[PDB]
Amino acid sequence: KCTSDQDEQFIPKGCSK
Protein backbone atom coordinates (compact mmCIF):
# COMPACT_ATOMS: atom_id res chain seq x y z
CA LYS A 1 0.00 0.00 0.00
CA CYS A 2 1.09 2.84 -0.86
CA THR A 3 -0.96 4.90 1.32
CA SER A 4 -1.49 3.59 4.46
CA ASP A 5 -3.29 5.58 6.57
CA GLN A 6 -2.18 8.50 5.06
CA ASP A 7 1.08 8.86 3.62
CA GLU A 8 0.77 11.00 0.56
CA GLN A 9 4.37 12.22 0.45
CA PHE A 10 5.74 8.80 1.58
CA ILE A 11 5.38 5.54 -0.36
CA PRO A 12 7.00 2.34 1.17
CA LYS A 13 9.42 -0.20 -0.41
CA GLY A 14 7.17 -2.30 -2.58
CA CYS A 15 4.45 0.11 -3.57
CA SER A 16 5.40 0.99 -6.82
CA LYS A 17 7.54 -1.39 -7.40
Q: What is the DSSP string of 1-17?
A: ---SSS-SS---TTS--
Asked if residues 1 and 12 have their Cβ atoms less than 8 Å apart, the reply is yes
Task: Write down the experimental method used for this entry.
Answer: NMR
Distances (CA, A) of 2 to 6, 7, 13: 9, 8, 9
Query: How much is the CA Rg of the chain, to the nearest whole Å?
Result: 7
Q: Give the burial string for 1-17 (b: 16+ CB within 10 Å, else e).
A: eeeeeeeeeeeeeeeee
**CB within 8 Å of 2: residues ≥ 6 apart:** 11, 12, 15, 16
Cα(17)–Cα(15) distance, integer angstroms: 5
Cα(17)–Cα(14) distance, integer angstroms: 5
Asked if residues 12 and 2 have their Cβ atoms less than 8 Å apart, the reply is yes
